[PDB]
Design an enzyme around this catalytic site. Structure first.
Site, mmCIF file in Angstrom:
data_model
loop_
_atom_site.group_PDB
_atom_site.id
_atom_site.type_symbol
_atom_site.label_atom_id
_atom_site.label_comp_id
_atom_site.label_asym_id
_atom_site.label_seq_id
_atom_site.Cartn_x
_atom_site.Cartn_y
_atom_site.Cartn_z
ATOM 1 C CG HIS B 41 -3.891 -8.207 1.719
ATOM 2 N ND1 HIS B 41 -3.087 -7.999 0.618
ATOM 3 C CD2 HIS B 41 -3.779 -7.092 2.480
ATOM 4 C CE1 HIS B 41 -2.527 -6.806 0.703
ATOM 5 N NE2 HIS B 41 -2.931 -6.234 1.822
ATOM 6 N N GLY B 143 -0.615 0.596 5.252
ATOM 7 C CA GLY B 143 -1.779 1.251 4.702
ATOM 8 C C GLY B 143 -1.612 1.738 3.278
ATOM 9 C CB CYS B 145 -1.984 -2.496 0.733
ATOM 10 S SG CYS B 145 -0.650 -3.274 1.669
#
Ligand SMILES: [Zn+2]
Ligand SMILES: [Zn+2]
Lengths: 306, 306
Positions: B41, B143, B145
């Protein structure tokens, strides 16, 4: 979101841990530049630790009596000296992996990460606080001596703790990187009393602010209180007194959540008098005091290091 | 002695974290050999995340649309592909700091360390468990991720988790390093239900053995019990059922302390029915289930890594 007992990344410290061996004793050492720091009782046997004369014991040792290993490479000791309770072994090779570092003596209530090592090899990392009685509730087995505690400020590594011994009560004591013990402890195997252990009130308050940030708000109540009124209740439950410097440090958290410091104190006061009633705050059924106001801000904003 | 929620040394992982940027989105990536792994993503905008067609979205992207940074050095993307929910970016340079590593898919109840990163830079490390409902109670901000979870076996790094999202309930979900989600979650911003969260009974028992080893013994009582009798009580309090494989794993701990597994179960049974009565075990007022039997043995013996 979420909140965890977070430790600093230990990468920069793993590259400084070495194995120090003198005679028969082996413990860990901190290799920075061309100096290796380690506890001075590495020159002691199990018999010597009962009542050691470190000066007389160091006379018997020479530079070649110390075996410094970094993984599988050897380090030649060129010089040796005793500064307070640490040994400074001057070696021929400067550690290439030396990061930017300072030596700092922390105060009670401050937190740091501990890298537990055995035979110069890292085994684990955890976060803890310096208790008001200058002890730490760590996890140390035989041979962990020389493990260091540290904080990280962006790119600089602040070394603040070197583990020296476990007290008969199970708690742990150590020195700064200059060899000065935290507390009234000496590097000797004898019965040593640690003072009354109190709760770090400023840390508990910071922790409660973290709870509000993360959705836990049941402990917020209707009352307020004064500094003296709260400190009176706090002293009965063996809580550190709250000063104006503590209120100032919590300012940023008070501004973020819109809850006055004194109002949060009133909430804690009721928790102290009435307990938790089987409830939890951030998954904890007890009041946590191992998060400083800076730790909370750090974890709730995302400060990083390189 | 002592017992702490200990995480693995993160040094070997810090050298593999990079910053991945596609269009406007930036998250973390894992750089191993000449491949960079990151959540898919990263090719999504805030609008796309509501209902993304990842295949159609990846058609629009080319190799030069991805910006991979390692500190301050750039990485040129030569190839790209989508494996399940992760993106595999083939780069020209092989990471020199690549340690020995495997990709492992863990099972519920197993524990691992998480290295939280932001913009490719490590910020903290903590230990957590994979809940029975395939979620983790972590600490992740926007952030984070791409942060990875990992275990360490001597010299090998087993990567088992990549963080992908925070659920509306505050818990966190992610995939293995092959892109397969843990649990029935999808990489989409929608209401997703996580199953009932149960307590990891085998971990609680291992934790109780750690308490006995460290001097906490008040919970040891007079009774015994059978597997079925305990599992009946356990299911009422939302505890995982105990199988014979769990008894076998606890064998070494039973031999060290001389307390039969079934006798420890009887002690836990009473704790479940009568509570703690304001007492603590290893400083905790709740029953801890984030220590596996292997973690307890590891910390109570001093297993190290290099
Ligand atoms: Zn020692
Ligand atoms: Zn994301």
């Amino acid at each position: 979101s979420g909140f965890r007992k977070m430790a600093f990344p230990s990468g920069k410290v793993e590259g400084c841990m070495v194995q120090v061996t003198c005679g028969t004793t082996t413990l860990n050492g901190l290799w920075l530049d061309d100096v290796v720091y380690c506890p001075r009782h590495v020159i002691c046997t199990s018999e010597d630790m009962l009542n050691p004369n470190y000066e007389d014991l160091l006379i018997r040792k020479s530079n070649h009596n110390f075996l410094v290993q970094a993984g599988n490479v050897q380090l030649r000791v060129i010089g040796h000296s005793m500064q307070n309770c640490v040994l400074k072994l001057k070696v021929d090779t400067a550690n290439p992996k030396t990061p930017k570092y300072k030596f700092v003596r922390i105060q009670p209530g401050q937190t740091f990460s501990v890298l537990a090592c055995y035979n110069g090899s890292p085994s684990g990392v955890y976060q803890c606080a310096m208790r008001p009685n200058f002890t730490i509730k760590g996890s140390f087995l035989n041979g962990s001596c020389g493990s260091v505690g540290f904080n990280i400020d962006y790119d600089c590594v602040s070394f603040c703790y070197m583990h020296h011994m476990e007290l008969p009560t199970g708690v742990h004591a150590g020195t700064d990187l200059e060899g000065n013990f935290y507390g009234p402890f000496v590097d000797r195997q004898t019965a040593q009393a640690a003072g009354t252990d109190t709760t770090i009130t400023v840390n508990v308050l910071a922790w409660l602010y973290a709870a509000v940030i993360n959705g836990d708000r049941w402990f917020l109540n209707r009352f307020t209180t004064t500094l003296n009124d709260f400190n009176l209740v706090a002293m009965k439950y063996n809580y550190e007194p709250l000063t104006q410097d503590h209120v100032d440090i919590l300012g940023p958290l008070s501004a973020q959540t819109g809850i006055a410091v004194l109002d949060m104190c009133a909430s804690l006061k009721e928790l102290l008098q009435n307990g938790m009633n089987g409830r939890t705050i951030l998954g904890s059924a007890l009041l946590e005091d191992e998060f400083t106001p800076f730790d909370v801000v750090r974890q709730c904003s995302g400060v990083t290091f390189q």
